[PDB]
């Protein structure tokens, strides 16, 4: 029999397998440290992997999870959960409740208390299947009192060919106890990458030899007539970056030669007190955080409280993360002193999971995968569900959206459906009330509203055209069980007002290319709205000469679609959110420059925005009971200040069509933090043009993150199938 | 890639030496083993001490058990071998050796050799 | 016989060759486009070249000539002259006197009038030797009515193995007509570099195959028992850079859609009028030069008159260079419109010859070269002399310093010697003169000089200690035939005053680590010197309220070695040079900040500076007759404004020793232009800290360039041999 | 690396076509030759036209001499073949071919083939 690589490419429309393989088995083959750039560049030197890419599913980049290391990425693929949820947050971590430390070279690696979640072999055992695992992180640990059917304790002295032959011998096991799910792991090209760097000759040799191993496996598969039955997933966990010895940061220069703290070094450095667990909570982290706050110009690191990190990282829920963290620029690392660190002139990984050099590999082959296709970028946390659809299993709950990755399969098993609203929207009717005085003195150039009833009473055609113009994709829905909201309609912006918290939840409008922005002043001018009862928070007196709080407008009054002045109805009472003094700079700069620039460049944008409340830093919206206690008190009144602000922008893929008639959608979402000061960006003698844009750049997110953190559902009236909508929502903006 | 040895010399019996081996071009942490090999006239290659830089486990010859001490500094990529209470036959030339991984069978047992330092003991 | 690469490394102390080879032959083997980074990175994949490097002379980088292309670099190696001297300035050029164009694909390539200078085979023919040339640029042209003994007209359809076998068959020719000098040329890895880029797989295959060809040649050499007789020089002409399609510059945006000009595109773009030769000289280049003067922020190109380019490029003497040129940033190119250009997404070369990606290869092997050595960086224009010392020939005059590259040879042939002064230095004695009034009103805080005779009369010990302190390496000598100079001695700075031009030629002093700089004002204060007759140029009235000229001080009065004030004797009449208004910014910023910074960091620096006059832009100092006519007239007086200003700094290699007792020398030289305005750097709303330092950065030079442009000779009292001094003078500073 | 053909279709006898070949992944300027190869039922491979992108010299078949015109655009990496006064037997499938350098003997005469476009002539 000739080598499998020499055969011409073919198609597998129906699997033919011996008895016992009604559902074809799945193989999970991992190459440590193999980054996507390797296949991008040296593909001509790798025949087998290139052929596998040509005759199967392929993606240019697969995004790992933060931190970008071995166990988090190797255990999130099988569990499907974020590192903050399945426990293993890094190769080195400390638990105060257990008062213990986790390490690769110690005996604590096999302690079952370190592992949470639920792997895939556990599900297979529960639903009547057998699995043979060979050197997968977490497989040799009694998780939930269950072992895999066949497993091997880790030992790095075993040659690769013995592992491959053992897998084949398990494949020739009789059908009585033949496993249905196999894994296999190799230590290269990670070791050569550390020793010699991403670009060298030893890495080329390692790539060629692991390709030879893959070809050996494929030839063994073909010799057994299983080359058209098995499902193969060629995967990787992270990438590699070249570290220099002149690109370290030492904390002894700033913090002095203190000897009561410990630092976890690397591109994901962290700080901890030395006295544990007594001083784990009583320690003063904020002092050190403010101590190193941009002590030098353009320093290549940034301190962060673990609840102030960007929400796209998901690195705050667990208690094994130290309350302080350092965000490092590309190619840079951090340490305390030169003694407490590893070598400097070698390759490294572990940086932010969006850098171009940290992306992983994903290739699929077999009857269940499409042939000669190329998909977009997706996260590894969604492979789990895919595997569950390749073995006919019901997945345990995880952090992947089922059906998002459904275009990689010939015959989809699961059909996603849109979530349904819990309760119908209540209505806020007009009610006669006395004309109260809010004590506001503003510019007389603003035209006051004469009759509230007359201008806000419209014929059904008016509401129809306003709904068509302002909500092309339909109103967002609410999934919260107990929340009473009413829909407020205006001339060019639509709002959802919540009676429980006394604040708007979402505001939607559209900005056209020819729309113009005014520049007049509109301060301390508030117009009362009769559709809701008055509130003492809704007066200029509360915000008059206050150094703690302020107010902002969700719908920008600078935008008028009919006149060159300012929009009067945008100055209503039901369009006010509490805001800090410093955040107004970012809000105003955005609404004044960036909105206009986006509208000009993209030919109109549909904008919907609102506040989000999350005091648990867990990624999910707070309940009413929890939200009740967190409200603050000031001036003998009770307020509830937002935690972040979300904004999302929609337009057409092609610039020749207005957003009202988009054939395809292009989306951009941001979740910005609400901070008292701007010390995060360290503005000092710097023009305002750049830092606001950079802050908006760093804090991007996906629509799924916004849906989780708000409880809202978007794009529920589009004619496209639910799978395409789920795929679009999971897309994370790239620049 | 190279390995350099330092700390050699001539000492009276009962003295103490601390040989140092500095490696460049690769990483000590990501190496299978780091060892010392001594050669004396009339004798062949002999393994006196070896260490695993990551695990920290050490392997020693019977002739030098209880007399030598091997250690590794990772932040500086160095291997230290301290020898005390030297004997008359301990005079020899020493090499710093790096072992290869057993992942591929068609590979040599050792990979690289150092320059080697000569040590003599006399009255 | 086993392959040559498998043999252990050996030494060749004496060549053993058959009859007719008393002087061993030399082979010049060229690999087009092979850059040094290839051997830096992929050396493990290239066994033969690595073995040749290990058992012979090697250098990390060899610097090409500007522009970095094929014929200039391939003809400068054999001629030894700069492209402005040997004629071939580029692959495409236009001669108006001939009214003709030179091109690679035309029949003008074989026109003997395009080639100047004198190649090496011509010298070998003159001095009784024979040479067999195989595809070397310029070899198939009747230069000076002489052909090489054996030559082949260029033809790219010949396989490499046929070329190698032909060279070997010539090597087996009988001694009656056996050549003594051979060449051989290959087209790769240049073609693969253009097609696929510097980093790809086809380049790896090309490198491996050219290595195989070299190994074939070495095996053929060994089979003939000539493996220990021949001298082998493995050389390359340039490097490769990856060009992107989003990094072009189009002149149609700025210059409009005009159709009366032509542009030579690439990273060495040039501009020419379309109507030639009638409008070649009458054209208005300055209008276009000022038109594109930094029209945008941080634009990645800079227009340049051909006589305003940095003096280290040597690209102005010939008349085949268009009077306008563009200096391009790395990885960027230039063109007029997208139609008049080549492809964009491909590799390219031709940029500035100091970029890290433009460096070439040099390896030497054989009896005449040292074994297992590694030299510093040197230019290719000095290989010629080396070859002349490997064949026992007398080199024709060129632009290489004979003996500089003498440490690469086992047995040197030529022993360099220091040049000698033409005439002894005249003395400027004191003469009684009336105390004239210069009409200067300055700060009274400056202490005036009471008795000129008393303070300037010193015992011989004083002159001895001053000479030791201020001239550690000895006074610079003058090589000009007709120039009368007198040596003026002061307390801490020594000057050379020229009677012919009425201006100092050089000023030398030393700055120590503990020396302090003052900040008081010292304007419009001039003290007359009685050692020379007075001049109407030497009065404050001439420079009082003048918008055209001004004056500057070679020795900085801000530096006082005994007091905290300012040095009075530095304000003498014999320490004044004409200066423009704009240049004073650079001069003052340097003398105030950079001198102090260098003195602090390097533990004292010996500084010697002066003006240089070069109106012919030919690189050599003007004669007195030529200099006489170029002097300008203003205010009924005659002045002679400098063209550039040279400054050179010396210190010890180790920071622990003062410059007075340097064991080894470290040197830094600059030749800065004297321009009326600072439009070159485009200062506009920018802090003064950066642009002056960048201008000093770009305009560095070697000591040999300063010696050529001044007529001075430095470092003639050091105890080191002349070869080491010549090697040090040829070193060009790198950062 | 790939080559794409455009401009095919169905024309009456005596019509004019201008086939275009666009190449990506390599450079037309630094290629040995660029040619067109036509295949018709009952016949094998046949070279109709070839061009050297740098020199500009062209080679033509006898059957199409005086009827075809080949050219190259370097700034866009395109090869154009204009054919006029078509005959009844000219219906065929056309391929854009790139020849290889003769530097190494152990290399194929051709390197890459295009997708190919089908052209028919009928009354
Ligand atoms: C890891 O695997 C290696 C090789 O499979 C084991 O080393 C073998 O140990 C057995 C003991 O029964 C010996 O007979 C072999 O000769 C050893 N092989 C080699 C190459 O040395 C090693 O013991 C395993 N480690 C653990 C902890 O089980
Ligand atoms: C990712 O999924 C997990 C599991 O569905 C979520 O964690 C659950 O959170 C709820 C509410 O806090 C708990 O009652 C469950 O016990 C948790 N399950 C597990 C397995 O820990 C987690 O919130 C999800 N993350 C995000 C960002 O949505
Ligand atoms: C360049 O060299 C090639 C090959 O050496 C020449 O092509 C050969 O021409 C002869 C004519 O006598 C033919 O017999 C060969 O068959 C040709 N070889 C090939 C491979 O085609 C070519 O003529 C040379 N060019 C010039 C201008 O002399
Ligand atoms: C490089 O060397 C050449 C040759 O020695 C120099 O060119 C000579 O310049 C003188 C004076 O202008 C002429 O009389 C000679 O005829 C020139 N010789 C040639 C061959 O052109 C040239 O000046 C040198 N360049 C530098 C920068 O020193
Ligand atoms: N159970 C395990 N499975 C795989 N690798 C392991 C395991 N335990 C320790 N390791 C080691 O941990 C390393 C992780 O490397 P990295 O991916 O750079 O963090 C691997 O290369 C192994 O050498
Ligand atoms: N006489 C010649 N010698 C060498 N190459 C030549 C000659 N005439 C033309 N060439 C071509 O010019 C090219 C120059 O390439 P480059 O070095 O990129 O400028 C070479 O690769 C040859 O194809
Ligand atoms: C916790 O662990 C530390 C370190 O191992 C140990 O000293 C201490 O006794 C343990 N228990 C408590 C209560 O701190
Ligand atoms: C940071 O802490 C160190 C030591 O506690 C102190 O010396 C330094 O002044 C602090 N930095 C500040 C307060 O900015
Ligand atoms: C010069 O060359 C040009 C272009 O080839 C030509 O038109 C002209 O006649 C020639 N002679 C003169 C005197 O311009
Ligand atoms: C440059 O020249 C063009 C055309 O001659 C002209 O339109 C433009 O204004 C010029 N730029 C200047 C004068 O800055
Ligand atoms: Ca929450
Ligand atoms: Ca001159
Ligand atoms: Zn890994
Ligand atoms: Zn790794
Ligand atoms: Zn070249
Ligand atoms: Zn080239």
Author numbering:
A (entry chain B), C (entry chain A): 187 to 921
B (entry chain D), D (entry chain C): 2 to 124
What do the study authors state?
Lastly, we solved a 3.2 Å-resolution cryo-electron microscopy (cryo-EM) structure of the VH inhibitor in complex with ENPP1, elucidating the allosteric mechanism of inhibition and providing insights for structure-guided designs of next-generation therapeutics. The cryo-EM structure showed the expected 2:1 VH:ENPP1 homodimer stoichiometry, with a VH domain bound to each ENPP1 ectodomain configured in a head-to-head dimer. The density for the Fc domains was not observed due to the flexible hinge and linker. All three VH CDRs engaged ENPP1 with impressive shape-complementarity, binding a region close to the active site, but not occluding the site or interacting with the residues in the nucleotide-binding pocket. Density resembling a nucleotide monophosphate, which we modeled as AMP, was observed in the active site (likely left from purification because no ligand was supplied exogenously), demonstrating that VH27.2 and a nucleotide such as AMP can bind simultaneously. Substrates like ATP and cGAMP bind in the same nucleotide pocket as AMP, the product of catalysis. This suggests that these substrates would also be able to bind to the ENPP1–VH complex, consistent with the observed noncompetitive inhibition. We performed epitope analysis by alanine scanning residues that formed specific interactions between VH27.2 and ENPP1. These structure–function characterizations identified the following two hot spots on VH27.2 that contribute to the binding and allosteric inhibition of ENPP1: (1) CDR H1 Y30/Y31 and (2) CDR H3 Y102/W104/Y105. The pi-stacking between VH27.2 Y31 and ENPP1 H380, a residue in the catalytic core of ENPP1 that coordinates Zn2+, may contribute to the allosteric inhibition and threefold selectivity for cGAMP inhibition over ATP. Therefore, structure–activity analysis revealed that the VH CDRs engage distinct sites on ENPP1 that separately modulate the hydrolysis of cGAMP or ATP.
